[PDB]
Amino acid sequence: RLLASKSLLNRYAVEGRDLTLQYNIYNVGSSAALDVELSDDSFPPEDFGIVSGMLNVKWDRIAPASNVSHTVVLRPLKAGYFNFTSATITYLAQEDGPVVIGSTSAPGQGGILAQREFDRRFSFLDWAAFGVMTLPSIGIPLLLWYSSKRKYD
Amino acid sequence: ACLEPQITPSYYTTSDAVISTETVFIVEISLTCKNRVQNMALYADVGGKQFPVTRGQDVGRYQVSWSLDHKSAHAGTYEVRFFDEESYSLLRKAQRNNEDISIIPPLFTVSVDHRGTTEVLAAAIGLVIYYLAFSAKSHIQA
């Protein structure tokens, strides 16, 4: 008997940035699950680029009381609301047994922030560069005032 | 067994500790064998901890991933040792026997180089300079 969970490891989904999905499958049965296949067709390639990992993965065997973790790195190509539906898992509970079909947890509907909106909310070095840009406004009077004072004080 | 494994490694490591809780390491390998054996199971060992290796959708693509606390994911080279089923079984036997695990040759190793992981200040500086300017004005007018 396999228990499987799907989790989104990113605190924020952002257009054009890496989106990391982790799949954890736990065998809680007394016997080993055979021919364990995980398939997640929820991510069409037109809206998500695969950077790393697989939406489809097979394992020959998961020992009893053992677990397997799979991680996929995607890149959302469009901003918007996306429904992270459950992936499908198939496995054999016994040799020559019927194929058992299971589903992972569904993280549900998440918002993919537009890159511009993400930067608007969370954009560091901008201040580092900006600090110097403000100095020139007062260069002349700042020097002249004290120079005159020293010449007369 | 895979004769003369030819590997093309590609790896990724989290660079930013502000947006992640843990440093994740991802190593992808394409394996090609002289005898064209396909669909072998591989096992990875990193620092004596074994991690499951997944098979890619494409033949000969394999991926292993592990995470570490940002404090423990020091900058440096992490050697990922990959084992076949036979050498993996020997490794598990030696580990159970507290035998020297270094005697068991890995099928191949992959070196993963990990490099490691204002408005308040602007107001403060402007405030302090303005406050001293106010003191200057008082002295000037005093």
UniProtKB/Swiss-Prot annotation, chain A:
Heterotetramer of TRAP-alpha, TRAP-beta, TRAP-delta and TRAP-gamma. Interacts with STING1. GO terms for cellular component: endoplasmic reticulum; endoplasmic reticulum membrane; membrane. The chain crosses the membrane at residues 127-146. This is Translocon-associated protein subunit beta. Belongs to the TRAP-beta family. One of its GO terms (biological process) is in utero embryonic development. Keywords: Endoplasmic reticulum, Glycoprotein, Membrane, Signal, Transmembrane, Transmembrane helix. It is a single-pass type I membrane protein. It is found in: Endoplasmic reticulum membrane. Glycans are attached at residues 67, 83. The keyword Endoplasmic reticulum applies. The keyword Transcription regulation does not apply. TRAP proteins are part of a complex whose function is to bind calcium to the ER membrane and thereby regulate the retention of ER resident proteins. The chain holds residues 22 to 176 of 183 of the full protein. Residues 1-126 are lumenal.
Curated annotation (Swiss-Prot), chain B:
Disulfide bonds join 2-33. There is a cross-link at residue 49 (Glycyl lysine isopeptide (Lys-Gly) (interchain with G-Cter in ubiquitin)). Belongs to the TRAP-delta family. GO terms for cellular component: endomembrane system; endoplasmic reticulum; extracellular exosome; Sec61 translocon complex. Residues 1-117 are lumenal. Keywords: Congenital disorder of glycosylation, Disulfide bond, Endoplasmic reticulum, Isopeptide bond, Membrane, Signal, Transmembrane, Transmembrane helix, Ubl conjugation. PANTHER family: TRANSLOCON-ASSOCIATED PROTEIN SUBUNIT DELTA, TRANSLOCON-ASSOCIATED PROTEIN, DELTA SUBUNIT. Residues 135-142 are cytoplasmic. TRAP proteins are part of a complex whose function is to bind calcium to the ER membrane and thereby regulate the retention of ER resident proteins. The chain crosses the membrane at residues 118-134. This is Translocon-associated protein subunit delta. It is a single-pass type I membrane protein. It is found in: Endoplasmic reticulum membrane. Heterotetramer of TRAP-alpha, TRAP-beta, TRAP-delta and TRAP-gamma. It is linked to Congenital disorder of glycosylation 1Y: A form of congenital disorder of glycosylation, a multisystem disorder caused by a defect in glycoprotein biosynthesis and characterized by under-glycosylated serum glycoproteins. Congenital disorders of glycosylation result in a wide variety of clinical features, such as defects in the nervous system development, psychomotor retardation, dysmorphic features, hypotonia, coagulation disorders, and immunodeficiency.
